[PDB]
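Hello,

I think I submitted the chloride ion job twice by accident. Can you confirm which output corresponds to this input? Input:
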Amino acid sequence: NLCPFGEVFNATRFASVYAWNRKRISNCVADYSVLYNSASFSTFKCYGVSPTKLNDLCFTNVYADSFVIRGDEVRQIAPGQTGTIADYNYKLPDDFTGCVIAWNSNNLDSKVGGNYNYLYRLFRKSNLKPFERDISTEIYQAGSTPCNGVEGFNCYFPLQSYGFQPTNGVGYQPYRVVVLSFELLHAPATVCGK
Amino acid sequence: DVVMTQSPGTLSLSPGERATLSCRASQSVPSSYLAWYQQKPGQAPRLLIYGASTRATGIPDRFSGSGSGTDFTLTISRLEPEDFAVYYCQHYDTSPRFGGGTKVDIKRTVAAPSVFIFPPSDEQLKSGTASVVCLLNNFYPREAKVQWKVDNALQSGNSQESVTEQDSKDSTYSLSSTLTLSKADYEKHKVYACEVTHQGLSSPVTKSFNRGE
Amino acid sequence: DIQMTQSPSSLSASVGDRVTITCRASQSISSYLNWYQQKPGKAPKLLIYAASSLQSGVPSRFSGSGSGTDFTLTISSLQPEDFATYYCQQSYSTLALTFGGGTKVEIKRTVAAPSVFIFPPSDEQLKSGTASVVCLLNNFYPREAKVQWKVDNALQSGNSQESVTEQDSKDSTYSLSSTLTLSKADYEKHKVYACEVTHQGLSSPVTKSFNR
Amino acid sequence: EVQLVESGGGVVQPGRSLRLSCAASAFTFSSYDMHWVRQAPGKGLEWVAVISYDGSNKYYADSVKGRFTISRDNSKNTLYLQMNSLRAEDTAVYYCAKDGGKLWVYYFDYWGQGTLVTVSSASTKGPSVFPLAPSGTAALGCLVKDYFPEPVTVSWNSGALTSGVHTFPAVLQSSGLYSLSSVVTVPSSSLGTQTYICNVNHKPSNTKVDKRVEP
Amino acid sequence: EVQLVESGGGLIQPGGSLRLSCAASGLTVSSNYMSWVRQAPGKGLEWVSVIYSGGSTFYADSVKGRFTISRDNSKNTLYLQMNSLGAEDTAVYYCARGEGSPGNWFDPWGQGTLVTVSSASTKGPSVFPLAPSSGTAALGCLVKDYFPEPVTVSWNSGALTSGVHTFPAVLQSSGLYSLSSVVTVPSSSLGTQTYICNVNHKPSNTKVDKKVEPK
Ligand SMILES: *[C@@H]1O[C@H](CO)[C@@H](O)[C@H](O)[C@H]1NC(C)=O
Ligand SMILES: [Cl-]
Ligand SMILES: [Cl-]
Ligand SMILES: [Cl-]
Ligand SMILES: [Cl-]
Ligand SMILES: [Cl-]
Ligand SMILES: [Cl-]
Ligand SMILES: [Cl-]
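Support: Only one job matched these inputs. Its output is below.
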């Protein structure tokens, strides 16, 4: 049967980028041509593979990661990028093999009074390794005094809200991102394009 | 990116009035990304307001920020002489951006300057140069005329002036005028005077000294 | 985008030499680096794909190597028909394909001195309003040559245009033409019209002039 | 044996539209992806767009996105590129390229000969040819000035005089037109005995001018 | 006790290199967003660089390829290596914790240090007294012929602050700076109170204490 890409692209609610969702796709037939021409996409970039070649290839597993960031940050969802999102929220490896797809979601994820439910990790001591997910909410220590779980001076909550309002400039508007990763192990393949 | 423009360039108000500083843009910017900074003369900027309307720690209550979308406002109620500074709005789009800044001047009553004249030291004269200094202290407004006279001969082209910004406590100005001569030229003349014309003076004030006395 | 930087921008070699062209990437592109050859006025032609795979029909004297961010194209024995421009092109970002700046392989010959000829504007042109002073540099090598316009010993900055031909098929030399364009009102304003030339094959700057 | 023939190039004013074609031959055209690649005058190569084998998927470079449109007709074995809202930065020679298809990624294995698209509001004006009289050999030539657009073909004695000729590339002067110089060095003995005539032709404006060159 | 103490400013020739320091107390440099913001004479504020706790660095387009931001955790100090300096780089450079973003504003700020890009030479000042005339009296110190800026002047090691006016430096025709610092005091204290001006020219580390007495 068909691979459930629509459950990812057509999901009514998306995850915050710090707690990005991952859908493991296996043992199915994938129709990529219909998937990529469904909705209009503002960002469509593939790395290491052509999007028209996927209908010929087989992979052990395909991962569909999805989250929401703002417009000025879509450029960070790419191999070799740095920044608050790429370092502390969602990191792609330098040899990333897959496609990054994004579209404007101002109508869905912005509110008149501001939608503060979408968060991102603002403070972290070290960078994330590729495909790492950190959902910790421990108080960040920015000084020499330990925080002991109490916010204060040099003691910050690590997450920060976006606050999406539909009249903001496109750089501040929310964008839903879907990252397709194509893993090729020395195991029998389960996802072939057709 | 979004360019934010501050207005007006300069604001001149009396103490106790309400100051309105604007930071506008042609695109709407989320209010959580807006900040205001204050920079007094010779000092580093300090955070006044963040998130458009949240007052920073230790900032007096008379500073309040408001606005959203395309019009953000910094309000300085109960203006004080110490509020003399330049105020910048600040936001982050793809990089930290600062506005052009709004200068807040403080008006006050007319104050006549106190004039003092200083002869050059003997230590400097041994070096071959004579600097004569005239001081105009604590006056308002800034406009003032300083004329150097050497043996009652008006000087031109051998003096330089320097003015301070408004005093943080009394909002006055101070001005220094330095007459520079060679030692040989300084010894050829006896009377050295600076004449001061200012709005607070009903007639020009002249301070002088006699070389060698 | 991924920037592709080729080095050198230009080189001069003779038939039989071993030519190596370098291509650098702003980030790792794995082995997805392709080489192309382009003749003046012709379409590009594929030489190497996937860094090292030789395209069918391309002579074996072409070979590519490298991985990550540094790549190299090698012509073991340069042939007369191999003088062209060679581009590298990354295919890692498949929907943002970018090319390198190119490396033009040229013919190395001995130093040739240019023959400087100057031509005044014809009588048939000065009645339209425009006046163009032309200076010519004929049959010289190498390409690097400076043409300086002096009108009344005043350097005519931002008032002329240069143009260089390709390497000649006979003596492998270049040729340069500088066209000082000015109105007729700017023409009778002055008197002296010279053309200074600085080249590798000249022991001193040569200047060819004429009087109106 | 893979052939690609373009057509539809020419002059166009800014903001107008132009459509290019690319007839393929001697390969399974309905199975390979197709590309468009342009090259500005004196500049390098720039990938424009790509279309899938069946024509269902299209991807464009950011410099032409929402402005150009790629399409293909597999029954006619032709590739199309509808260019709308043309800017002066779009002035380039446009190539179509067949995808290699041997990798997971795109690469061009065969290219078309290319057609020129000159985006400018300047009307197709004919050239004004002026002679260059000579003042130990001598040199003489002709000055093809003020013509739009590229190109103009210049020969001497109807192509009989081949040795010693140097035709220089055109330059875009400040007046939006082009200026070109063509010279030929001849022995100083056969000057009044040998006659020299430069043959200038401008196909976009349909202008053929033959001018005599004498000292 | 939160402080950002800056140093490293002064005179540097065009094309030279300079490294600024920002020693921190009350916060951990390696655990924070740390930025450099500069201010040209008489102009506004311009963000220049930032370094993340995770190691990422970013720069403004005006300094990319010439500046390098770094840190030393054992010294808890932020650095800014400036290369290929020009007249546009002459400014007061501030360091600050944060990046001017939500939950991450510029706070606190360092005191700033002045970088003067000039082909001239560093010169120490000469300090001369402005003796009071023989209710309120005025006295001061003339600080003459120094380069580059700045000089600071205090009175009685900081114990005298009321009525002090230190004028902005003026550029003399010799290319050297000069300023005066004055103070008004009661005339009754001229014989019982000692007045000493403390001049500090940091670019040369020239510190002069000058006793100002009636003549
Ligand atoms: C997702 O929704 C679009 C319309 O919004 C639909 O055309 C598409 O088929 C859906 N995805 C799948 C996998 O069915
Ligand atoms: Cl705006
Ligand atoms: Cl907000
Ligand atoms: Cl400070
Ligand atoms: Cl005033
Ligand atoms: Cl700069
Ligand atoms: Cl720079
Ligand atoms: Cl100073």
